[PDB]
Design a protein around this ligand. Structure first.
Ligand SMILES: N#C/C=C/c1cc(Br)cc(Oc2ccc(Cl)cc2OCCn2ccc(=O)[nH]c2=O)c1
Lengths: 416, 549
């Protein structure tokens, strides 16, 4: 391999040093996998062993590709990204098309391998250093740094930008109705075509890229035109106890914060006096009128809620049980950009961590499609547990930022 | 004479920083001669070079007499240089754990002398290492030197030496794959399963190899007969344990004393099953000072007593056998306290350990068990590179009914039920639905947030009403004590209804134990009951409610 022009100069944000993040301990299996992988990548001159004079480190994990038996190496570049990519966001930045979410179908392709063709700027290489950890600190880890553009670093899709635009240009002009957006190592291709026809166009693009030297190792198929903020549902029941009306009034009270108009004032008079919880209550005229106020005002979303590109995206997930989970993506409290639910199977395979991982990946993907950025998650899981088991189910080239929330009181009831 | 033919590691100063300039003219006219001798003997070995005053840099040098007086040693203060030099890769933040080592037929321990002085230093950097022995006096210029090798105490010596040693070893490890070598600082720990004679041979080969590289090794045998007192361990050929731990006896204890105490206890807990640090550590919430005297409690005294009882009879650990299964067993101990043993064999323990929760007010047994399992998973991954088979004192019905309806996501590996009481169980379960015909208490309570006086009260459906006065209480403790009140005044089946999101928060999580006495009482009432249903209604929304101001 040879560079067409000299390596693209890559500097760091002023007053910022390279990432010193420590390497997570690994199982012997994953270590061996990373050792084969890195031996081969070193044989291919993609990476090089480094000395004690390289203080920087960013973690490495071993995750599988799709369903296969091939071990893949995933580097967490989030820190190096925060450091070098914030002004690589502005300088080389790839603008986000706003029409990708309106198209009837969207497919995703992994183009990351392409980055292995381009060499990385020498001066910057020290910052890509990683370590394969030994079991039980019996030896110091194995230390490599990237010679070429590493996957997962967001400087790589920015540097490869021009080339991707070249390769894509003919396909783009031949198909004006197709939206193509590169986020990280992924190509997101939207169309209004029928599913089969969309797959034809997609296979066309695949083979095109393939004969331009771009390898792309049914599949991942998105339908963003089914995506909308999910409304609030008040229960449908034949006979109503006092407790049911309590929950009704409560959920209505919490919901009244989002939408101002609704009022429960006529539903409280049926609970007048001190009732037994299981006492059955009829439904009067006025309360039913205020229920008519209740249901039709909750099926139409709030106004004045707009996305702010400056503010981060925050995603909260709550476990509703039986494999079901719910989520909300929003910048500021009481204002919701995106709202949804997710349902895995009834078991025979899945567990909590699996379902949560798939959920997080889904939500991140949606956010990538819509806002061109990944949300920051508040995760309903113990920190150590996630940090241990998350790589197991992780099928994606990127990683979102995350924290761990310990305290939902009532919200599981309210969002179901 | 240990010179070296080794590739040096390039070193730069922190950007925008020049070399250290610090000077000492006076005193020590006795030790200055020792410095002369030391430096002349260090020059012939090529370790240092005398330099012409071209205006280079300077750092202090002191000659300290060693104890048991025989020879003099030379000390240099590099803190300034270390402040101005670049950052390196962390040599070791960890230690290997003996429980993870593989049992070998022969283990040889070599220590390389003049380790740092046997590794050459980068040329362009050498000027920054310049130190100058003063001259007695009369305004005669002192003798200027600089280091040609890794200076002792320098910032980049351990890492660079580790690298150099690694590379020096690299060919030999390939030539003799049947033996295993570990690097720790200077020390090389070699081991093999082959014949004792073959072992002696290989060891001698390696010794002469290192000596060809300029790294000296013990000339009389390998020395170092097992034990093997290493890093606070006793390493026996077939066994491993902890160096003797002396627990003192005192009339008065300070923060330093309790800290060192809980330290030694922690260090003991790995090989000694049953160690409890909880109350003793609770005494350390007095961290305000250091030399401040802390009076012991009864629980702490009994804790230290039980620990003393545990330590009095020695017990040992066993090494690792990758061809054997890995098992982990957790047993319940005391308030917020758990203990585990990891073993491949029934009576042979790889190690032991403890777990306790220092953070959060209220938590139940299933949760704490889960957390223990997690800690052991992490620990086993770090030590052995895998996750063991867990054997737990919990029924599957229990845990299944736990992680299903627990709001938090959690995962636990393959685990087998073992019956060794106490078995972890659910002491009570709240109803998910209200109780028919059963008395429904409407509870409330409040407090003046200044006077710090409050009231806790209830109004039922059957017409019963009550208000209990409460002194020195806040708004939360009142609305908890209202639930308490409704509990103690109700039959075996009760529907309690509160406007407190706090109280509902505590109760709905279903803690079996807390450190709050009131919450402990509420727990006891919940256990004593049969069917309890907690329900919540928005505060000040004018439902049935209790209004007492
Ligand atoms: N100073 C001092 C000594 C410290 C020290 C520190 C470490 Br880390 C390891 C070590 O010895 C070993 C070295 C390599 C291997 Cl593969 C196993 C070892 O032990 C296997 C178990 N074993 C350990 C000791 C012994 O005599 N016989 C034996 O079979 C020694």
């Amino acid at each position: 391999p040879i560079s067409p022009i000299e390596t693209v100069p890559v500097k760091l944000k002023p007053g910022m040093d390279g990432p010193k993040v420590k390497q997570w301990p690994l199982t012997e299996e994953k270590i061996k996998a990373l050792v084969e992988i890195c031996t081969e990548m070193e044989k291919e001159g993609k990476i090089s062993k480094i000395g004690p004079e390289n203080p920087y480190n960013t973690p490495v994990f071993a995750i599988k590709k799709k369903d296969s038996t091939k071990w893949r190496k995933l580097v967490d570049f989030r820190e190096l990204n925060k450091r070098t990519q914030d002004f690589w966001e502005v300088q080389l930045g790839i603008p986000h098309p706003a029409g990708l979410k309106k198209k009837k179908s969207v497919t995703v392709l992994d183009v990351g391998d392409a980055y292995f063709s381009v060499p990385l700027d020498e001066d910057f290489r020290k910052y890509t250093a990683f370590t394969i950890p030994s079991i039980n600190n019996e030896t110091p880890g194995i230390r490599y740094q990237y010679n070429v553009l590493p996957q997962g670093w967001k400087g790589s899709p920015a540097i490869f930008q021009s080339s991707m635009t070249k390769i894509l240009e003919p396909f783009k002009k031949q198909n004006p109705d197709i939206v193509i957006y590169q986020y990280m190592d992924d190509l997101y291709v939207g169309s209004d075509l029928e599913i089969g026809q969309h797959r034809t166009k997609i296979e066309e693009l695949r083979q095109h890229l393939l004969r331009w030297g771009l390898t792309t190792p049914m599949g991942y198929e998105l339908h963003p035109d089914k995506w909308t903020v999910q409304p609030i549902v008040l229960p449908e029941k034949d006979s109503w106890t006092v407790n049911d009306i309590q929950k009704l009034v409560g959920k209505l009270n919490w919901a009244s914060q989002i939408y101002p108009g609704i009022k429960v004032r006529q539903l409280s008079k049926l609970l007048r006096g001190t009732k037994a919880l299981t006492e059955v209550i009829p439904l009067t005229e006025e309360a039913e009128l205020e229920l008519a106020e209740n249901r039709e005002i909750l099926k139409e979303p709030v106004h004045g809620v707009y996305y702010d590109p400056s503010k981060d995206l925050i995603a909260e997930i709550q476990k509703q049980g039986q494999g079901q989970w719910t989520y909300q993506i929003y910048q500021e409290p009481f204002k919701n950009l995106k709202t949804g639910k997710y349902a895995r199977m009834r078991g025979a395979h899945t567990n909590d961590v699996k379902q949560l991982t798939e959920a997080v990946q889904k939500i991140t993907t949606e956010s990538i499609v819509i806002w061109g950025k990944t949300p920051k998650f508040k995760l309903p899981i113990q920190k150590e547990t996630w940090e241990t088991w998350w790589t197991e189910y992780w099928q994606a080239t990127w990683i979102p930022e995350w924290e761990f929330v310990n305290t939902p009181p009532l919200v599981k009831l309210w969002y179901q | 004479v240990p010179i070296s033919p080794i590739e040096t590691v390039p070193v730069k100063l922190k950007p925008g920083m020049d070399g250290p300039k610090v000077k000492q003219w006076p005193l020590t006219e006795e030790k200055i001669k020792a410095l002369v001798e030391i430096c002349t003997e260090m020059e012939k070995e090529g370790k240092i070079s005398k330099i012409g005053p071209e205006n280079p840099y300077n750092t202090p040098v002191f000659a300290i007499k060693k104890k048991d007086s025989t020879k003099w040693r030379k000390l240099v203060d590099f803190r300034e240089l270390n402040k101005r030099t670049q950052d390196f890769w962390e040599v070791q933040l960890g230690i290997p754990h003996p429980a993870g080592l593989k049992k070998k037929k022969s283990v040889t321990v070599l220590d390389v002398g003049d380790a740092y002085f046997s590794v050459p230093l980068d040329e362009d950097f050498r000027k920054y290492t310049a130190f100058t022995i003063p001259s007695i006096n009369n305004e005669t210029p002192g003798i200027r030197y600089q280091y040609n090798v890794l200076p002792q105490g320098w910032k980049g010596s351990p890492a660079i030496f580790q690298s150099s040693m690694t590379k020096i070893l690299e060919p030999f490890a390939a030539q003799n794959p049947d033996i295993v070598i570990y690097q720790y600082m200077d020390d090389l720990y070699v081991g093999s399963d082959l014949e004792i004679g073959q072992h002696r041979t290989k060891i001698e080969e390696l010794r002469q190899h290192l000596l060809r590289w300029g790294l000296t090794t013990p000339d009389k045998k390998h020395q170092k007969e097992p034990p093997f007192l290493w890093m606070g361990y006793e390493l026996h050929p077939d066994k491993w344990t902890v160096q003797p731990i002396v627990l003192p006896e005192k009339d008065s204890w300070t923060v330093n004393d309790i800290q060192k105490l809980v330290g030694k206890l922690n260090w003991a807990s790995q090989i000694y099953p049953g160690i409890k640090v909880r109350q003793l550590s609770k005494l350390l919430r007095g961290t305000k000072a250091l030399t401040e005297v802390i009076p012991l409690t009864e629980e702490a005294e009994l804790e230290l007593a039980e620990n003393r009882e545990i330590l009095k009879e020695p017990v040992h650990g066993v090494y690792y056998d990758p061809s054997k299964d890995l098992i982990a067993e957790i047993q319940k101990q005391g308030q917020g306290q758990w203990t585990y043993q990891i073993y491949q064999e029934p009576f042979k323990n790889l190690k032991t350990g403890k777990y306790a929760r220092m953070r959060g007010a209220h938590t139940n047994d299933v949760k704490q068990l889960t957390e223990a399992v997690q800690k052991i998973t992490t620990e086993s991954i770090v030590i052995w590179g895998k996750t063991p088979k867990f054997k737990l004192p919990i029924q599957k019905e229990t845990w299944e009914t736990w992680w299903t309806e627990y709001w938090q996501a959690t995962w636990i590996p393959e685990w087998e039920f073992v019956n060794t009481p106490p078995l972890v169980k659910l002491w009570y379960q709240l109803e998910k639905e209200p109780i028919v015909g059963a008395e429904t208490f409407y509870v409330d309570g409040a407090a003046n947030r200044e006077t710090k006086l409050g009231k806790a009260g209830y109004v039922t459906n059957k017409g019963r009403q009550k208000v209990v006065p409460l002194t020195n209480t806040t708004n939360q403790k009142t609305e908890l004590q209202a639930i308490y009140l409704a509990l103690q005044d109700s039959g075996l089946e009760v529907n309690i209804v509160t406007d407190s999101q706090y109280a509902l928060g505590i109760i709905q999580a279903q803690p079996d134990k807390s450190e709050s006495e009131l919450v402990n009482q509420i727990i006891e009432q919940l256990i004593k009951k049969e069917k309890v249903y907690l329900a919540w209604v928005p505060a000040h929304k004018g439902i049935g409610g209790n209004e007492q101001v």
